[PDB]
Design a protein around this ligand. Structure first.
Ligand SMILES: CC(=O)O[C@H]1C[C@@]2(C)[C@@H](C[C@@H](O)[C@H]3[C@@]4(C)CC[C@@H](O)[C@@H](C)[C@@H]4CC[C@@]32C)/C1=C(\CCC=C(C)C)C(=O)O
Ligand SMILES: CCCCCCCCCCCCO[C@@H]1O[C@H](CO)[C@@H](O[C@H]2O[C@H](CO)[C@@H](O)[C@H](O)[C@H]2O)[C@H](O)[C@H]1O
Ligand SMILES: CCCCCCCCCCCCO[C@@H]1O[C@H](CO)[C@@H](O[C@H]2O[C@H](CO)[C@@H](O)[C@H](O)[C@H]2O)[C@H](O)[C@H]1O
Ligand SMILES: CCCCCCCCCC(=O)OC[C@H](CO)OC(=O)CCCCCCCCC
Ligand SMILES: CCCCCCCCCC[N+](C)(C)[O-]
Ligand SMILES: CCCCCCCCCC[N+](C)(C)[O-]
Ligand SMILES: CCCCCCCCCCCC
Ligand SMILES: CCCCCCCCCC
Ligand SMILES: CCCCCCCCCC
Ligand SMILES: CCCCCCCC
Ligand SMILES: CCCCCC
Lengths: 144, 156, 240, 457, 240, 48, 48
C-alpha cells in the first residue's frame, strides 16, 4: 500500500524472482511491478506438468523468500494461485434504492453470500469484486 | 487545445517532423500539462536538441516555470544536456532562476557532477554563492558529494 | 520415494521451525533442495583479455548467469565458485571512537538513509471532487553507488561540521563472502557447480544449461568466456 | 484516458459509454457493468472497462443486433470522444489463445542498461517496425508510458538539526498519503483490517505536504516544508520483467497475406540492429507456435507414410495405394471453395473437417479399388471391366452416405443463432468438401486406379 | 465498533482534557482500497467471480449456485438485487443441445435415405440401432481418457457422423446388393457381403487412425485443442 | 496462544475454512477451536 | 579436530555499572568481527 512501481520492483519483485530456483518444468517467468502498490509474478510451466506440484513448489520457494520482503508486504500477504481467466459466471449484486454504497454491498456479500457460494457443489473458486469493510481512520493534520 | 497536447506528446517523444508540422499549423508552444510543463520543459528533460531550438524560434517562454518553479534550464542542467543548456542561455534563459526550494541550475548541475555544464553556467554569470532553502551552495554540494574536480572550479 | 513429495514434507516441517530460528538466519535465506550430492558439471568463466578480476567475473556470473541456470529444469542446486558483490562498509574503530560512534550508529544510519519508502500519491483514491492531478510521490530510494553510501550523514557536530560514513569507513563493492576463489589453468576465474535434481536426466539438463548459456554469451562484456573444465555428460554420450 | 488523468475524469467517460448503450442500444443491451480504475493493459485512475451484457438471442433478431454489428457502431460512435481511447470488442471463444497472425515479443535489458535505455531501444524497434507496414501491423507496446511523479528529498542534515527522526518523517508521509494497514479488528464476528490514512482534502496537491507536522525530540512540531524539497520528474508506473531481467512486452501481428512466422523473422532481424545489451525473446502464443511449428512436418510425414503402408498391406501392392491417396484434393477443393465464398477462415473446425472429408473420400476410394482389384484377382476380369463393375456396385452406398450426411450438416451451415460461429465453421467446410468429394471421386477414382495399374504393369 | 475506535486515547493534556482518536480523525467502516468504482446501470455494485472446480459439471454448478442465491433472497436488506451480467451456462446448454439435435436428425435422415433406396423398414432399423450404439459407446471411451462433454469433443462427434453413418450404410447396402444380384438368403448373403468388405473395413480403421492419431501429438494450447478432436474421432471411428 | 475458543474460531478457524473450498475429492471437513487457543481442521477425502 | 578459539566473557555487572547495554556490546562485537547484513541496495539494476 502506497508503493510506487520501482519501490515494489526493488523490494518485492526482484527478491521473489531471485528465489524461484529449483522449481521443475518452468518454461518462462514474467512480472509486473506497478504504482497501485501491486506486483504480479506469473510462472508458466510445461504442458502436462502437475499444477498442484508447480504451485506448492512456487509457494515453498516464496515462503523462504518472505523474511527478505518488507514488513508491510509480509503483513498484507503474498498470494500463490493457479492462473485461470475463465469464470463459470459473474454474480452481480446492486442497491436500487440508494441506501448502500459499493463498499456496503461488498461487505454484505463477503459476510452473508461469498462463503455459502464457495461451499456450493462444483464451485472451484469464488472472487469478491470489492473488499469486506475496513475500519478507516481518516486523519486530519490540523487537529493532529 | 487539441494541437497543444499533440505538441506536448511530440516534444517528449523527440518526433522532430511532427513538431515542424504542428509549428506550421500554430500549435500552442505555451501549452502546459497538469504539473505545468511546456514542450520546452519536455524537450529540455529528454534531451531533444533540435526541438528546443525549433520551440525557441516559435516564441516559446525560455523562463516558463512549472507548479514547483523549475525552468527548462534546471532540467537540461540537471540531466547533463550540454548543447540545450548553451542554446537556452543564448535565447536568454535566467541562469540564476530559483525553484520553490531555492535550487538553481548551478546546484542541480553541481549535484549530478556535470563539469562542462557548470563551466557554461558560470560563463553566462551564475551566482556561485546562491543558497537553497537549507543555505547550501554548489560548493557545499561538491564537498558533500566529494567531487574534487568540481570543488576546484566553484572556488573563486 | 517421490522427491517432490519428500521436499514438500521436509519443508512443511521446516516452516514450523522457521519462526524459532534467529532473524539473521532467516534473512540469509534457508533453502530445501532435492539434488544429487555430486556435481553434474562445472561451468567455468574466465576473461581472455585480463580486463576483469576474479571478484568482477564472480559478480558477473552471480548477477547475469546464475539465476537463469538455477531456474532451469533438472538443476537441483547451483554453487557459485566466488561471491556476488555487496556494498562493503569496512568500519574503522579509531575513526568511529573519535566521533563517539559505534557499529550500532552505522547500521541505524544505513537503515534510515538506504531506504525504499512507500510515500503514496498526489490525488490518490479516495480523492476530493474536482481533482485534476494524479502522480506517485517518490521519497527515499535505495542507494546505487559507493559515493552515495559514503555521503550518508551519521552525525552533525556542535560546531556544525558533518560526520559522513566515508569519514569512519572504507566503502567498496566486494563479495558477500571472501571464502571461495577459483582459478582455471592458473588464471583468474569464477564458475557454477551444477548438481543434477533428484531423478532428472543428466544429458537433457546439460543440453538445457548449454542452451541457456548460449542466450547470455551475446551480451557478455569484452574478454568474458565460458570454459568447460568438468562435465560427466560427454562420457555418457560417447560411451553409448 | 491520457496518463495522469483522475478517477473522476474516467468516471465521466464511463457514464457517457453507459448512457450510449442504455440509449442507442436499448433494444439489445440488458446492462453495462462500469468498472472504473481497471484495465488489462495496467491498473490506475486513468483506465476503465464497461462489460456490456445483451438481451436474449430471441429478443435480438437479425445481423443488425448481433455483437459484431453493435461493436462496429459503438467503436465508431465513441470515435468523437475527446481525451479518451474508447472502443468496444467481442470476447474470444477461448481467452488464452489470443489471435493467429498475432505475436508476443519480449525486449530484454541483458546488460543493466536501465529503464530509460530500454525505453529508447523499444522506441527504436517500434520506429523500424512502422517502416515495414507490408509485413507488420499494430506493432505496439503492451505496457504503460512514464508519467509525471513528485520527487521529495528529505534533507538528512536539517532533520537531525531539528531533532526529527527519519522514521517519524517516512511514517507520517507514508501513513497520511499512501495509507498504513495497522492491525485487525472483529466486526460482527469477522476479522477485518484497520487502515489509517489522510482525509482526501489533505493529500491532493503539493501545497498539502506543508500542512503535515512531525514532533521533534524537544516536543516542537515541524512542518514537512522545513526539512523537504520537491521537484517533478518522469518515472514508470508499471515496470515489466521477463525471466528475472527488466523487459518491455511488444504485441503486433503479421500484415494481411503474411504468415506469423515471416512477421516474427523480421522482428528478429530488426531486433539484431538494436543497441548493445538489448536482447529479445518470444513468449505466450509465439513461444507455443515456434515449438508447435517444428512438430508439424514430422506428424504430416508419419501420417502419410503409415497410410501408404496400411493400403500397401491391404492391396498387397506398392503401387495401388497411390490410386486411393490421389483422392485427397477432391474433398479439399470444395471445402476451400465453400469457406472462401462464405467469408470464413482456416480455423480448427475447418481443419478437422478436411480430415473427416479426406477420410470419407479415402474410405469410398478404398472400397472401389478393393472391388475392382478382387474382380481382377478372383474372377480374372480385365482392368476396365473390373473398374467399371466396381464403381457401378459402389455408386449407391456413396450417394446414400453423401445425401444423408450433406442433409445432416445443412442446418449447421445456415445457422445464425447462439454458437453459430462454430456450427458455420464445422458445417460450411464439410458440406462444400462433401459435394466435390462425392461428385469428383465417382469420376476420378476409376481414372486413378486405371492410370496407376497401367504405369506399374 | 467505530464507537470504540473513536474512544481510543491519544494523550491527556496538562489541564486534564483527553485527546481521543475521534478528535483528530473521522472513523468509518469503508473499503480496503478505493482504486475501483464498480457500477451496474449507474447503480453502485459488487459481485462474485465464480469458477468451475476440476472435473465439475458446469450446468449442475450453475443450477446449484442459483438454488443457494434463492435461499439468500429473503435475508437481503432493502434494495439489494442479484443480477447475472456474465454466465456461460445458457450458451453451453444450447451448444450441447444443438449437437444432440444434429446427431438425432443425422440418424433420422439416414432412416429416410435408407428407406428411399432400399424401401423396407428392417434395413432402415439396422443403422438406427448401430449408430446410437457407437455414439453412446464413444462417451464410455471419452470417460476412459478422462475427457469432459465440451464444445470441442461434441463438435468432434458431428464431424465424425459422416464416418459412423457410412460404416452402417456400407454393410447393409452390400448385403442388399449381394441378395438382389445372386439371390442368396440373408444369412449366406451377409457371409459373402462381409467377405468382400471386412478386410477393407480393417484397412480403413488403420488408415483413419494414421490420419487422426498424429493430431494428438501436437504440443501447447493448439496441440491440446487438436487432441480433443483426435481422441474423440479415433474413438468413435474405432467402435464403428 | 492465550486466546479463547470464540476468538480463535473468528480469527483462525473460519479464515482457514473459507479457503478450504473447491479441493479435489473432499468428502467432509470437521474442525474444533478450544480455550487453549488450538485449532484442528481435519479434511477427509474420497477412498483411493 | 578441535582448534584454539577466543572465549570472551561479557561481565554483566560492570556493563550495568558503566551503563552500556548488552545489545550494543553484542552488535558491536558481532558486526565488527563477524559481519552484519544490514539491508539491500541496487547495483546496476539488480538487488544486492
Ligand atoms: C429430446 C432431445 O432432443 O434430446 C434429449 C434426449 C436425450 C438425447 C437427452 C440427453 C441424454 O440424456 C440422452 C440419453 C442418451 C442419456 C443416457 C440414457 O439415459 C439414455 C436412455 C438417454 C436417451 C436420450 C437422451 C435422454 C437430450 C438432450 C441433451 C440434454 C443435455 C444438455 C446438456 C442440455 C437434449 O435435449 O438435447
Ligand atoms: C440419440 C443419440 C444418443 C447419443 C447422444 C447422447 C448425448 C449425451 C449428452 C450428455 C447429456 C447429459 O448431460 C446432462 O444433462 C442434464 C440435463 O440437461 C444436465 O442437468 C443440468 O443442466 C440442466 C440444464 O441447465 C438443468 O436443468 C439441471 O438442473 C442441471 O442439473 C447435466 O448437468 C448433464 O450432465
Ligand atoms: C504392429 C502391427 C501393425 C500392423 C498394421 C498393418 C495394418 C494392415 C491393414 C489391414 C489389412 C487387412 O488385411 C486383409 O485381411 C484379410 C482378412 O479378412 C485377408 O484375408 C483375405 O483372404 C480371404 C480368404 O478366405 C478372402 O476371402 C478375402 O479376400 C480376404 O479376407 C486379406 O488377405 C488381407 O489383405
Ligand atoms: C489419405 C492420405 C492422408 C492425408 C491426410 C494426412 C494429413 C494430416 C496429418 C495430420 O495429423 O495433421 C493434423 C492437422 C493439424 O493442423 O490438421 C489439419 O490442419 C488438416 C490437414 C490439412 C489438409 C490436408 C490436405 C493437404 C492437401 C495437400
Ligand atoms: C471402454 C470402456 C471403458 C470405460 C472405463 C471407465 C473408466 C472410469 C474413469 C473414472 N474417472 C472419470 C473418474 O476417471
Ligand atoms: C480407442 C483408441 C484411441 C487411441 C487414441 C490415442 C491417443 C494417444 C494420446 C497421445 N498423448 C499421450 C499425447 O496424449
Ligand atoms: C509415402 C510414399 C512412399 C513412396 C513409396 C514408393 C513405392 C513405389 C514402388 C512401385 C513399385 C510397383
Ligand atoms: C518408408 C517407406 C517404405 C516404402 C517401401 C517401398 C518399396 C518399393 C520397392 C519396389
Ligand atoms: C497406427 C497409427 C499411429 C500413428 C502414431 C503417430 C505417433 C507420432 C509420435 C511422434
Ligand atoms: C432426403 C429424404 C428422402 C426420403 C424420401 C421419402 C421416403 C418415402
Ligand atoms: C488379418 C488382419 C490383421 C489386422 C492387423 C491389425
Amino acid at each position: 500500500p502506497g508503493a510506487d512501481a520501482k519501490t515494489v520492483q526493488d523490494t518485492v519483485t526482484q527478491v521473489i524472482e531471485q528465489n524461484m530456483n529449483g522449481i521443475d518444468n518452468l518454461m518462462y517467468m514474467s512480472s509486473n511491478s506497478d504504482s497501485t502498490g501491486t506486483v504480479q509474478i506469473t510462472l508458466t510451466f510445461e504442458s502436462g506438468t502437475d499444477a498442484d506440484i508447480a504451485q506448492v513448489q512456487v509457494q515453498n520457494k516464496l515462503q523462504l523468500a518472505m523474511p527478505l520482503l518488507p514488513q508491510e508486504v509480509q503483513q498484507q500477504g503474498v498470494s500463490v494461485e493457479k492462473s485461470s481467466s475463465s469464470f463459470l459466471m459473474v454474480v452481480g449484486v446492486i442497491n436500487t434504492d440508494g441506501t448502500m454504497t459499493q463498499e456496503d454491498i461488498s461487505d454484505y456479500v463477503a459476510a452473508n453470500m461469498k462463503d455459502a457460494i464457495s461451499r456450493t457443489s462444483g464451485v472451484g473458486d469464488v472472487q469478491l469484486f470489492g473488499s469486506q469493510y475496513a475500519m478507516r481512520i481518516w486523519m486530519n493534520p490540523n487537529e493532529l | 487545445s487539441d494541437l497543444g497536447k499533440k505538441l506536448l506528446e511530440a516534444a517528449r517523444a523527440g518526433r522532430d517532423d511532427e513538431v515542424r508540422i504542428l509549428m506550421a499549423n500554430g500549435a500552442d508552444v505555451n501549452a502546459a500539462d497538469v504539473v505545468g510543463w511546456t514542450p520546452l520543459h519536455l524537450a529540455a528533460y529528454w534531451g531533444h536538441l533540435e526541438i528546443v531550438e525549433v520551440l525557441l524560434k516559435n516564441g516559446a517562454d525560455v523562463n516558463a516555470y512549472d507548479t514547483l518553479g523549475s525552468t527548462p534550464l534546471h532540467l537540461a542542467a540537471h540531466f547533463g544536456h550540454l548543447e540545450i543548456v548553451e542554446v537556452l542561455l543564448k535565447n536568454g534563459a535566467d541562469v540564476n532562476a530559483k525553484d520553490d526550494n531555492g535550487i538553481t541550475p548551478l546546484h542541480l548541475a553541481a549535484n549530478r557532477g556535470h563539469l562542462e555544464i557548470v563551466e557554461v553556467l558560470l560563463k553566462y554569470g551564475a551566482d556561485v554563492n546562491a543558497q537553497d532553502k537549507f543555505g547550501k551552495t554548489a560548493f557545499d554540494i561538491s564537498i558533500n558529494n566529494g567531487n574534487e574536480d568540481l570543488a576546484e572550479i566553484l572556488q573563486k | 520415494t517421490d522427491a517432490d513429495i519428500a521436499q514438500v514434507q521436509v519443508q512443511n516441517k521446516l516452516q514450523l521451525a522457521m519462526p524459532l530460528l534467529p532473524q539473521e538466519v532467516q534473512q540469509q535465506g534457508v533453502s530445501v533442495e532435492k539434488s544429487s550430492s555430486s556435481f553434474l558439471m562445472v561451468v567455468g568463466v574466465i576473461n581472455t583479455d585480463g580486463t576483469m578480476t576474479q571478484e568482477d567475473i564472480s559478480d558477473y556470473v552471480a548477477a547475469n548467469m546464475k539465476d537463469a541456470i538455477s531456474r532451469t529444469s533438472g538443476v537441483g542446486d547451483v554453487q557459485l565458485f566466488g561471491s556476488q558483490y555487496a556494498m562493503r562498509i569496512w568500519m574503522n574503530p579509531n575513526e568511529l571512537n573519535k566521533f563517539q560512534l559505534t557499529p550500532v550508529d552505522v547500521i541505524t544510519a544505513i537503515k534510515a538513509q538506504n531506504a525504499q519508502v512507500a510515500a503514496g500519491q498526489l490525488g490518490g483514491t479516495p480523492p476530493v471532487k474536482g481533482q485534476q492531478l494524479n502522480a506517485s510521490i517518490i521519497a527515499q530510494t535505495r542507494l546505487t553507488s559507493t559515493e552515495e553510501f559514503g555521503k550518508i550523514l551519521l552525525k552533525v557536530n556542535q560546531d556544525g561540521s558533518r560526520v559522513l560514513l566515508r569519514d569512519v569507513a572504507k566503502i567498496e563493492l566486494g563479495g558477500e563472502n571472501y571464502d571461495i576463489i577459483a582459478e582455471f589453468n592458473g588464471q583468474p576465474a569464477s564458475g557454477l557447480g551444477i548438481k543434477l535434481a533428484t531423478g532428472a536426466n543428466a544429458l537433457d539438463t546439460a543440453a538445457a544449461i548449454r542452451a541457456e548459456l548460449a542466450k547470455m554469451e551475446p551480451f557478455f562484456p569484452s574478454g568474458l568466456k565460458i570454459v568447460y573444465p568438468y562435465d560427466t555428460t560427454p562420457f555418457v554420450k560417447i560411451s553409448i | 484516458l491520457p496518463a495522469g488523468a483522475t478517477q473522476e475524469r474516467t468516471q465521466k467517460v464511463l457514464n457517457e459509454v453507459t448512457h450510449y448503450y442504455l440509449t442507442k442500444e436499448k433494444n439489445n443491451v440488458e446492462s453495462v457493468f462500469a468498472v472504473n480504475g481497471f484495465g488489462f493493459a495496467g491498473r490506475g485512475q486513468n483506465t476503465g472497462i464497461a462489460f456490456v451484457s445483451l438481451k436474449d438471442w430471441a429478443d435480438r433478431p437479425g445481423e443488425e443486433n448481433k455483437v459484431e454489428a453493435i461493436t462496429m457502431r459503438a467503436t465508431r460512435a465513441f470515435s468523437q470522444i475527446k481525451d479518451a481511447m474508447v472502443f468496444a470488442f467481442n470476447l474470444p471463444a477461448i481467452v488464452e489463445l489470443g489471435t493467429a497472425t498475432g505475436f508476443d515479443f519480449e525486449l530484454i535489458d541483458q546488460a543493466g542498461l536501465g529503464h530509460e535505455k530500454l525505453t529508447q531501444a523499444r522506441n527504436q524497434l517500434l520506429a523500424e517496425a512502422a517502416k515495414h507496414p507490408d509485413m507488420l501491423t499494430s506493432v505496439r507496446p503492451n505496457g504503460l508510458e512514464d508519467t509525471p511523479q513528485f520527487k521529495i528529498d528529505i534533507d538528512q542534515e536539517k532533520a537531525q538539526a531539528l531533532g526529527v527522526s527519519i522514521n517519524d518523517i517516512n511514517t507520517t508521509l507514508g501513513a497520511a498519503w499512501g495509507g498504513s494497514y495497522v492491525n485487525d479488528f472483529i466486526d460482527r464476528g469477522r476479522v477485518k483490517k484497520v487502515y489509517v490514512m489522510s482525509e482526501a482534502k489533505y493529500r491532493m496537491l503539493p501545497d498539502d505536504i506543508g500542512d503535515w507536522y512531525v514532533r521533534a525530540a524537544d516536543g516542537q512540531m515541524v512542518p514537512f516544508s522545513a526539512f523537504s524539497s520537491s521537484r517533478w520528474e518522469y518515472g514508470s508506473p508499471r515496470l515489466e520483467r521477463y525471466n528475472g531481467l527488466p523487459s518491455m512486452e511488444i504485441l503486433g501481428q503479421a500484415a494481411p497475406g503474411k504468415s506469423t512466422g515471416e512477421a516474427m523473422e523480421l522482428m528478429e532481424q530488426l531486433a539484431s540492429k538494436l543497441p548493445t545489451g538489448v536482447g529479445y525473446d518470444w513468449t505466450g502464443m509465439s513461444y507455443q507456435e515456434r515449438l508447435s511449428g517444428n512438430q508439424a512436418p514430422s506428424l504430416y510425414a508419419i501420417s502419410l507414410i503409415v497410410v501408404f503402408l496400411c493400403l500397401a498391406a491391404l492391396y498387397e501392392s506398392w503401387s495401388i495405394p497411390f490410386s486411393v491417396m490421389l483422392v485427397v484434393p477432391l474433398g479439399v477443393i470444395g471445402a476451400l471453395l465453400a469457406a472462401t465464398f462464405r467469408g470464413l477462415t482456416n480455423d480448427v473446425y475447418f481443419q478437422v473437417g478436411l480430415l473427416t472429408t479426406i477420410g470419407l473420400s479415402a474410405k469410398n476410394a478404398i472400397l472401389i479399388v478393393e472391388f475392382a482389384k478382387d474382380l481382377m484377382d478372383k474372377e480374372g476380369k480385365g482392368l476396365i471391366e473390373a473398374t467399371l463393375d466396381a464403381v457401378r456396385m459402389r455408386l449407391r452406398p456413396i450417394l446414400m452416405t453423401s445425401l444423408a450426411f450433406i442433409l445432416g450438416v445443412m442446418p449447421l451451415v445456415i445457422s445464425t443463432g447462439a454458437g453459430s460461429g462454430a456450427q458455420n465453421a464445422v458445417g460450411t467446410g464439410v458440406m462444400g468438401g462433401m459435394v466435390t468429394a462425392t461428385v469428383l471421386a465417382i469420376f476420378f477414382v476409376p481414372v486413378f486406379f486405371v492410370v496407376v495399374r497401367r504405369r506399374f504393369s | 465498533s467505530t464507537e470504540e475506535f473513536g474512544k481510543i486515547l491519544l494523550k491527556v493534556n496538562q489541564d486534564g482534557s483527553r485527546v481521543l482518536l475521534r478528535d483528530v480523525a473521522k472513523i468509518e467502516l469503508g473499503g480496503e482500497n478505493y482504486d475501483i468504482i464498480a457500477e451496474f446501470n449507474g447503480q453502485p455494485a459488487s459481485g462474485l467471480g465464480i469458477k468451475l472446480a476440476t472435473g465439475a459439471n458446469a450446468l449442475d454448478t450453475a443450477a446449484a449456485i442459483r438454488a443457494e442465491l434463492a435461499k439468500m433472497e429473503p435475508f437481503f436488506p432493502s434494495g439489494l438485487k442479484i443480477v447475472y451480467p456474465y454466465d456461460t451456462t445458457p450458451f453451453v446448454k444450447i451448444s450441447i443441445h444443438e449437437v444432440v439435435k444434429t446427431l438425432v436428425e443425422a440418424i433420422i435422415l439416414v432412416f429416410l435415405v435408407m428407406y428411399l433406396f432400399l424401401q423396407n423398414f428392417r434395413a432402415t432399423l439396422i443403422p438406427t440401432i448401430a449408430v446410437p450404439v457407437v455414439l453412446l459407446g464413444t462417451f464410455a471411451v471419452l470417460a476412459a481418457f478422462g475427457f469432459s462433454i465440451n464444445t470441442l469433443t461434441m463438435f468432434g462427434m458431428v464431424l465424425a457422423i459422416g464416418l459412423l453413418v457410412d460404416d452402417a450404410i456400407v454393410v447393409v447396402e452390400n448385403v442388399e446388393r449381394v441378395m438382389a444380384e445372386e439371390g442368396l438368403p440373408p444369412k449366406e448373403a451377409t457371409r459373402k457381403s462381409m467377405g468382400q468388405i471386412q478386410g477393407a473395413l480393417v484397412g480403413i480403421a488403420m488408415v483413419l487412425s494414421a490420419v487422426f492419431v498424429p493430431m494428438a501429438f501436437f504440443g501447447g494450447s493448439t496441440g491440446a485443442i487438436y487432441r480433443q478432436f483426435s481422441i474423440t474421432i479415433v474413438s468413435a471411428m474405432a467402435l464403428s
